[PDB]
Amino acid sequence: SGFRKMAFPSGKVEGCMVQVTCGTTTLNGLWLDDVVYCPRHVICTSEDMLNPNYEDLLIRKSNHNFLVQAGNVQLRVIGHSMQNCVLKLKVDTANPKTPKYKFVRIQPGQTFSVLACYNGSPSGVYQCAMRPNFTIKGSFLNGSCGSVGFNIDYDCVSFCYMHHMELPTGVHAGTDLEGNFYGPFVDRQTAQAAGTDTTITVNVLAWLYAAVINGDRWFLNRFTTTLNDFNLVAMKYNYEPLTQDHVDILGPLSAQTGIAVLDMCASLKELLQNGMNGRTILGSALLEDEFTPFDVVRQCSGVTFQ
Amino acid sequence: SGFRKMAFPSGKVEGCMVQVTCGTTTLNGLWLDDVVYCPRHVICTSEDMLNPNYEDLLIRKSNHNFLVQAGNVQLRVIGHSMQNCVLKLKVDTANPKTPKYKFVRIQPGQTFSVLACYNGSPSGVYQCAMRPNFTIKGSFLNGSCGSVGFNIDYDCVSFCYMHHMELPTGVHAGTDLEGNFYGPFVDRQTAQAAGTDTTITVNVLAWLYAAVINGDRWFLNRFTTTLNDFNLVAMKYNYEPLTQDHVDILGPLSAQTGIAVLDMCASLKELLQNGMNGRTILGSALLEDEFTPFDVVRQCSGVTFQ
Ligand SMILES: O=C(c1cc(=O)[nH]c(=O)[nH]1)N1CCN(c2ccc(Br)c(Cl)c2)CC1
Ligand SMILES: O=C(c1cc(=O)[nH]c(=O)[nH]1)N1CCN(c2ccc(Br)c(Cl)c2)CC1
């Protein structure tokens, strides 16, 4: 038992991280097969950041302008292209540690692990959620661009995020691995703001089920509510509305605890209207919304990865 | 910027995890050079768990009673011995992925990363602290025994924890890699209880410095206190006393923020006596004590690992 913010083991990804230098700018790249992927803003200088024309900037570059290092080994760049906001550097050597992988775009509310890197070298791993406003609340310092987010499905790494920038409010923004930005952001050093965030309701419910599994039951009650009655209260507190699809997803947790979803919604309704009154749930004094139903099952039932 | 519960990258450890079977009992082992380390209670059956005599139990075993699997490859056990509460299985093949490593015993209040494993296969990584009562608040299911805790110093893995059991209160207990139990626990299925836990004061202060670095300043004030005045209040709230050694350790964070340690102690004194009044610090409504001063520096200043 117990419940922790658990990340995926990062070994399969650590062997793919490289350092990419263009001019006086260095950041991280992702080396799969014979391609290195990195944020295209590595080709910007100080004069270009405010309003870059990436097509012009890229045509003025040659392969030898790009220095790629995998530890000590230097990778020779034999070609380069741009795919949306990502630069694809073709190199002469295919990464022998290339895992089975795919590129997936995730949805708001889903979670993934982040491998924070500096100078191509892995620094730490942590779990986060894609927020409803398409930002993530990450932890990144200067030099972290090109760090990736991933999930592990069986033996397959699903890459879903590459880090590009920090917004003024301290939250982070990036792209999928096809270079399409999550959210209405662009890779230029202008003043961009995220929209208002909301709380991920289906995740809060999954976490309340994790609490019950771990012996925290004080917030339960005998009432029940309807989907429309709950959603009417949730709207008032900046909570995402709950759909029938969310109810079915919570099914396995309802069965393991014998507590129906709509029963749990009534408990959440009370917690929203009255607060926790100095009591905690799973060691938190706030409602946690960065665990999906699958995260809870994986940690409260058990799923390993070969 | 940002602040997350960050674990160390686990790749170097994932290549050392193996499955160890003795009879109908399977758990995880740590394979370094030509030795596999695992909890000695793998040699217990149902009749032995209540009052095991491990010397008798071990003499009745031969090398062929121990099945060790590294993925698919079977490792031939050519010898076995017992070191305190750990079994050392000598195998015919040295692990070629053996990293530079050492065995260290950590102190209460220090943090480490846990690689949770099932059937020799890594499942997740998370950060935790050794509590003042020598337990950890982990997340472990049936089959997790032999999972290890570690820190990474430069390129060296310092192994500090091997998981042995869950106590009745839901917290976890284990040994260092020499097989010496952290705390007054023994590997028998009797009713053992942890002593009362206290809050790790130097860690709370480090976290308040992380908050200031990340722009949370509402709890600051202009007062100052003495070490003895603070400790008098901290004792009342089940907080570890603060020593001059703790003050020096916090030095780098005091310098980066310009806020003296004793100034921060006065803020903490107020937070203990008045509460947070519905306000949060770094997204928490409770005082967090599982980040050391070094954790904060590493995340709020930057340290990678080759
Ligand atoms: O490495 C970091 C960084 C990431 C982070 O999350 N937090 C932090 O403090 N620093 N930066 C800032 C973004 N930057 C950047 C350069 C050109 C363009 Br065009 C754009 Cl859009 C961004 C590259 C360097
Ligand atoms: O795998 C787990 C486990 C760990 C955990 O943390 N949580 C959980 O639920 N299960 N166990 C329980 C301990 N057990 C065990 C066997 C013999 C002896 Br003698 C002792 Cl002392 C313990 C081996 C099997």
Flag if A6 and B125 touch (Cβ within 8 Å): yes
To one decimal, the resolution in angstroms is: 2.0
Q: Which two tokens stand for residue A298?
A: 């994986």
**Burial, A245: exposed, middle or buried (Cβ in 10 Å; 0-12, 13-18, 19+)?**
exposed
What CATH number is attached to the domain comprising B264?
A: 1.10.1840.10
Q: How far is A251 from chain B (nearest CA, A)?
A: 21
- What is the C-alpha separation between B252 and B256, in angstroms, rounded? 6
* Cα-based angle B123, B70, A121 (whole degrees, multiple of 5): 55
Does residue B18 contact residue B36 with C-beta atoms inside 8 Å? yes
Tell me the catalytic residues of B: 41, 145
CB of residue B39 inside a 6 A radius of ligand 2: no
* Cα-based angle A240, B2, A87 (whole degrees, multiple of 5): 90
Q: Which two tokens stand for residue B77?
A: 């056990």
What CATH number is attached to the domain comprising B35?
A: 2.40.10.10
Tell me phi and psi for residue A268, to 5 degrees.
-60, -40
Q: Which two tokens stand for residue B143?
A: 């089959």
- What is the C-alpha separation between A267 and A258, in angstroms, rounded? 15
Looking at all shown ligands, the one closest to residue B175's CA atom is 2
Q: Which residues touch B150 (CB under 8 Å, ≥6 apart)?
A: B8, B13, B112, B113, B115, B157, B158, B159, B160, B161
Which residue in the block uniquely carries the two structure tokens 């790494």? A157
Does residue A284 contact residue A194 with C-beta atoms inside 8 Å? no
Nearest to B126 among A6, A119, A215 (CB): A6
Residue A69, beta-bridge partner list: A19, A74
Strands A17-22 and A25-32, by their bridges, are antiparallel
Q: How far is A147 from chain B (nearest CA, A)?
A: 13
The residue type at A262: L
User: Would you tell me how many other CB atoms lie within 10 Å of the CB of residue B154?
Assistant: 9
How many residue contacts between A and B have a Cβ separation below 8 Å? 155
- What is the C-alpha separation between A172 and A209, in angstroms, rounded? 29
For residue A294, CA distances in Å to A24, A205, A303 come to 43, 12, 10
* Cα-based angle A27, A32, A38 (whole degrees, multiple of 5): 25
Residue A27, beta-bridge partner list: A20
Q: How far is B4 from chain A (nearest CA, A)?
A: 6
Q: Which two tokens stand for residue B187?
A: 């590997």
User: Would you tell me how many other CB atoms lie within 10 Å of the CB of residue B141?
Assistant: 15
Nearest to B123 among A126, A128, A304 (CB): A304
CB of residue A144 inside a 6 A radius of ligand 1: yes
SS3 content of chain B, % helix, strand, coil (to 5): 25, 30, 45
Q: Which residues touch A205 (CB under 8 Å, ≥6 apart)?
A: A242, A246, A250, A261, A264, A265, A268
Helix, strand, or coil (residue A279) = coil
Which residue in the block uniquely carries the two structure tokens 């139903």? A293
Domain assignment of residue A219, given as a range: 201-300
Flag if A3 and B139 touch (Cβ within 8 Å): yes
Flag if A5 and B305 touch (Cβ within 8 Å): no
**In terms of CA atoms, which chain B residue is nearest residue A295?**
B124
Flag if B141 and A1 touch (Cβ within 8 Å): yes
Flag if B4 and A122 touch (Cβ within 8 Å): no
A22 is catalytic: no
CB of residue B205 inside a 6 A radius of ligand 2: no
**In terms of CA atoms, which chain A residue is nearest residue B136?**
A2
